[PDB]
């Protein structure tokens, strides 16, 4: 039996206290106005074991404790743990353990299973999730954490499913860490009757949920339904105005996500530069280049708390996500008077006669006080720095000119007379000194990124390669949604000719073995939704640009769509226009006044029954 589930089965995505918000989440939900299964009881059952794909939504309106159990398990025989929610009166508990559930899921003393095995985390929650009146429960599981819901609410007179909106309150979710592929329901029998098993299916589709300051959900849109409710979530609101708007490719939702960021597992000894025994001076520094590594910036702050850890260009907290190609590391030691002087654009003595960052520098400086490390009572003259030179320099101009400072008027060349000094000024370090003169060891990490295959990225793991399906790809930071195809393109074109003001990623370079991953849009078809406003009625239309009233069905993938939207993409009452094809209107041979500018001189209105019409812009 197939019925219609109209706006029922909405739960809370996250366990936060957001109030008066419009949060759009992407989890497993039940699409509105979808077909579900409804069975009864006879006196063994009415349907076999239903496949538990992602989640389950059970509805029941009976009483006297007829349906008070749920079975969850992969195979129920030599497998992982199984969820058993047995609702009782004196010893109502949730015994989550590995059992031997047979084919008969009859409650009524425990004849559901045969034997027990090793158990796991078991909840002892005495509050029973039991209470005409309709009982609805949403069971789901993600990241090894089974989530339960319950919205037992008084129901109206006898019917199949009540109207209105409901939000199942969050129950006591529990971590188990298993997988479920089969689902059953327990039934109680007095003499060893009828029941109402209402089972559905949860798909990973987007969902817009609006909250209230009182602490409850007022209304929510499925965002995977008729063009009106489809466009309702693209504007992040619950009301629309009279006019034609565009979609956001939310019809085909990306089921899976692929990352495939790294390709190696060997770590990187970048900490070997930070804990070096003897560093270098500012006069003659050494830049170490690293490539083909695995950068793990989380272990950077494992040392003593540093000072002035300002990372310009990138986010200091978000460092383990963006990839690069080369890692340059130059470390030296400066005085405490210039701890903040070393900065991009900040001028001074070291910005002129020493190392200096360019205008755009994605790397970061990291400095730590080393007063207890480099300090000599007589004087630490081994660490010096160039201060006296001819003129200014440019970034990355390491000079090792060991000559006499000769910017004066007369060529001293050894005598060191007027305007003649030593370039490398040897300033000493001593323990008995102030904090302003303490030595600070500073390393300048440089993250060089070129138009080359990735060599060193973040420490994230890898995913599976999914093909021929609308997925979400995040290979090398090009976070997008589409389908990956294997085209005959021998080389990957560099999309930089016309500066790519408005151009999407047509293809990506596979970080794994050499492949051609061309990116294709899942379903765009140039869909435009003409909403006359929810205040008037709930009837909209559709427009498709670049079709011939016959190619639109095979272009928007009408086969992989909801049955409610299929009727709005048929060949009936279609009209060929100079900008595409109009579907869902009646082309009137006459015109009165232009109200809704569909396009190319075509204007629509909403008059009487009340429906969308089609005409031209007569002047």
């Amino acid at each position, epitope marked *: 039996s197939y019925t219609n589930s109209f706006t029922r089965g909405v739960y809370y995505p996250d366990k936060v206290f957001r109030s008066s918000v419009l949060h759009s989440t992407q989890d497993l939900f039940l699409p509105f106005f979808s077909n579900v299964t409804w069975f009864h009881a006879i006196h063994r059952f009415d349907n076999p074991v239903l496949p538990f794909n992602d989640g389950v939504y059970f509805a029941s309106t009976e009483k006297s404790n007829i349906i008070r159990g749920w079975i969850f398990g992969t195979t129920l025989d030599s497998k992982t743990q199984s969820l058993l929610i047995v609702n009782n009166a004196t010893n109502v508990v949730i015994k989550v353990c590995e059992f031997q559930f047979c084919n008969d899921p009859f409650l009524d003393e425990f004849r559901v299973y045969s034997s027990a095995n090793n158990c796991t985390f078991e909840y002892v929650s005495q509050p029973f999730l039991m209470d005409k009146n309709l009982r609805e429960f949403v069971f789901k599981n993600i990241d090894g954490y089974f989530k339960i819901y319950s919205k037992h609410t008084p129901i109206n007179l006898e019917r199949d499913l009540p109207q209105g909106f409901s939000a199942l309150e969050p129950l006591v979710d529990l971590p188990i860490g298993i997988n479920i592929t089969r689902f059953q329901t327990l039934l109680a029998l007095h003499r060893s009757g009828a029941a109402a098993y209402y089972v559905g299916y949860l798909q990973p589709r987007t969902f817009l949920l609006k909250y209230n300051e009182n602490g409850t959900i007022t209304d929510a849109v499925d965002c995977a339904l008729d063009p009106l409710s489809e466009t309702k979530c693209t504007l992040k609101s619950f009301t629309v105005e009279k006019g034609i708007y565009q979609t956001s490719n939310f019809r085909v939702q990306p089921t899976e996500s692929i990352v495939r960021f790294p390709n190696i597992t060997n770590l990187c000894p970048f900490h070997e530069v930070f804990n070096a025994t003897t560093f270098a001076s500012v006069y003659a520094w050494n830049r170490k280049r690293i490539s083909n590594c695995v950068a793990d910036y989380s272990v950077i702050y494992n040392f003593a708390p540093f000072f002035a850890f300002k990372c310009y260009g990138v986010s200091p907290t978000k460092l383990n996500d963006l990839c690069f190609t080369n890692v340059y590391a130059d470390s030296f030691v400066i005085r405490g008077n210039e701890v903040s002087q070393i900065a991009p654009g900040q001028t001074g003595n070291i910005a002129d006669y020493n190392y200096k960052l360019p205008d755009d520098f994605t790397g970061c400086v990291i400095a730590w006080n080393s007063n207890k490390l480099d300090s000599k009572p007589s004087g630490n003259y081994n660490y010096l720095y160039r201060l006296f030179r001819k003129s200014k320099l440019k*970034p990355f*101009e390491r000079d090792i000119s060991t000559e006499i400072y000769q910017a004066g008027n007369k060529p001293c060349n050894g005598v060191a007379g007027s305007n003649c000094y030593s370039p490398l000024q040897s300033y000493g370090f001593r323990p008995t000194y102030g904090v302003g003169h303490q030595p600070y060891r500073v390393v300048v990490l440089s993250f060089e990124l070129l*138009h080359a295959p990735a060599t060193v990225c973040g420490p994230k793991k890898s995913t599976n390669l999914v093909k021929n399906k609308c997925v979400n790809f995040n290979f090398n930071g090009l976070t997008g949604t589409g389908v990956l195809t294997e085209s005959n393109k021998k080389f990957l*074109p*560099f999309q*930089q000719f016309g500066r790519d003001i408005a151009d999407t990623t047509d293809a990506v370079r596979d970080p794994q073995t*050499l492949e051609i991953l061309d990116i294709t849009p899942c379903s765009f078809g140039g869909v435009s939704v003409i909403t006359p406003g929810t205040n008037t009625s709930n009837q909209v239309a559709v427009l498709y640009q670049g079709v011939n009233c016959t190619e639109v069905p095979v272009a928007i993938h009408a086969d992989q769509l909801t049955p409610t939207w299929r009727v709005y993409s048929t060949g009936s009452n279609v009209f060929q226009t100079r900008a595409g094809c109009l579907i869902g209107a009646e082309y009137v041979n006459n015109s009165y006044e232009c109200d809704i500018p569909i396009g190319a001189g075509i204007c629509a209105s909403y008059q009487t029954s009340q429906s969308i019409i089609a005409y031209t812009m007569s002047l």
Partner: nanobody
Amino acid sequence: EVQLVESGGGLVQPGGSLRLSCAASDFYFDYYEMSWVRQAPGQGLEWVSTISGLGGATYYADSVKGRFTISRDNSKNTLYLQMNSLRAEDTALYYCATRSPFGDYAFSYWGQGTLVTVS
């Protein structure tokens, strides 16, 4: 206000040797990296090789990896591309470009390009 002039090009034969030049006058940035690009009939543009300005890092494409060679001499500030063992799929317009390593993937400047026509 800078430019990248090129020199050298014409009809050649398969399995030969060719030298392409890329010079500049007002360009003095040391960290700006250099690169070559090729435009062939039918397709658009394809990257050939890249010399990083931070150090001595050189990188080639997948087809011209062990075939061509590059040399970025900073004494007179000029780039040279020596193409040996010219195959059939080498007739194209070659352009020299310069881009900053820190930033987007788009090239900062272009060149005049030379037509390498393999007989």
